[PDB]
Amino acid sequence: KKDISNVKSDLLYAYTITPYDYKDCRVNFSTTHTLNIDTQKYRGKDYYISSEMSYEASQKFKRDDHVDVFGLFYILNSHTGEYIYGGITPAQNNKVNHKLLGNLFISGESQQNLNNKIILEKDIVTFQEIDFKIRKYLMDNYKIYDATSPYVSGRIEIGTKDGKHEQIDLFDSPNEGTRSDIFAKYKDNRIINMKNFSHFDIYLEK
Amino acid sequence: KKDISNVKSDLLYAYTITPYDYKDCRVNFSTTHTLNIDTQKYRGKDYYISSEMSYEASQKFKRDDHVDVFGLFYILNSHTGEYIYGGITPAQNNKVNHKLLGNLFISGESQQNLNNKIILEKDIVTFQEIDFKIRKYLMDNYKIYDATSPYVSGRIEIGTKDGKHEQIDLFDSPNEGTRSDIFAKYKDNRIINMKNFSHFDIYLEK
């Protein structure tokens, strides 16, 4: 397997990044595996976002649909395009604010309360957006990916109102551990409806 | 299976098209499944070709390589991009002319000589380019895809100097029979070196 210090290294680099956050963009057209979205209003002439997704995900969107974008690039220096995986939801029409409830469980420590630290402004959100914001919070506040951090494993659990949980591994660097490898998981464009969202639980093992 | 008149219908439409033929273009960058190539000198500002290929094929090309393009689009009305499958070879440096030798075998007729009808100007060529030129010749001269054509099956056989043959089905319309379906086969970017090329044989069954 891959050694923990390499994993952290990969992730520190990969997630130290500025996400693309564009609201209400029109889908120009679909390709075999991607959606080409108009971001000219934000980035200038001829600019577009190229979102690679699974077939099932893509079929939910068609030419001219209005969409919101939240994704992390896996390529740099790419002309008029910005390349990401998934990160697409139907455009949010009315303004909205969701203050998330959450808890932090660090090995051998007492539960920490993280309520209201993370706020979302969409009713329908991608796991990619949720994942990123939480990781960033953890990186910023707990330096989870620093070489000297004591964490050796951990995950995020998204809890829904039916009592179920969705897990997201926090220390996984597949294949060569490049952004393309690490962000590939977002290609399913998994989304969650805030109305079903309960709270999140983070587990870090020392 | 698919009925023959539908197949011909699909192919008539699909192959009635003007190919993109651009020489000496620079590769801008690679994505997970495509190559983004600079065609600004031919199509204008910000224009590019996007060539989708198999992993193995793509790895043969890197940023800044000079390449020649010969491909058929599978998408229309796509902004500053032109989308195709494969169709990429290392740029041809010196001028060249290859007059191909070939034969036509139509069921119950005598062999027809097709020598020198098809000419190539590259030493290294894609099957896509070879396939297209021959099909077009057949469409133009034998109307193989017309509803009233008598052909019910057939193929092209590319013969190499070692005595081997590569077959290309002339009447295959997979899946929904869209250009995306029919041209997907070109994604392997299969190429042939003219020095190994012997002649081609076409078989049409009535």
UniProtKB/Swiss-Prot annotation, chains A, B:
Keywords: Signal, Toxin, Virulence, Zinc. Gene3D superfamilies: 2.40.50.110, 3.10.20.120. PROSITE patterns: STAPH_STREP_TOXIN_1 (PS00277), STAPH_STREP_TOXIN_2 (PS00278). Coiled coil: none annotated. Pfam families: Stap_Strp_tox_C, Stap_Strp_toxin. It comes from the Bacteria. The keyword Phosphoprotein does not apply. InterPro entries: Enterotoxin, Staph/Strept_toxin_CS, Staph_tox_OB, SuperAg_toxin_C, Superantigen_bac, Toxin_b-grasp_Staph/Strep, Toxin_bac. The keyword Zinc applies. Zn(2+) binds at H165, H199, D201. GO terms for molecular function: toxin activity. One of its GO terms (cellular component) is extracellular region. This toxin seems to be coded by a bacteriophage. Belongs to the staphylococcal/streptococcal toxin family. Superantigen that acts as a causative agent of the symptoms associated with scarlet fever. Has been associated with streptococcal toxic shock-like disease and may play a role in the early events of rheumatic fever. Superantigens cross-link major histocompatibility complex (MHC) class II and T-cell receptor (TCR) molecules, resulting in an overstimulation of T-cells associated with a massive release of pyrogenic and inflammatory cytokines. This is Exotoxin type C. It comes from Streptococcus pyogenes serotype M18 (strain MGAS8232). The lineage of its organism: Bacteria, Bacillati, Bacillota, Bacilli, Lactobacillales. The gene is speC.
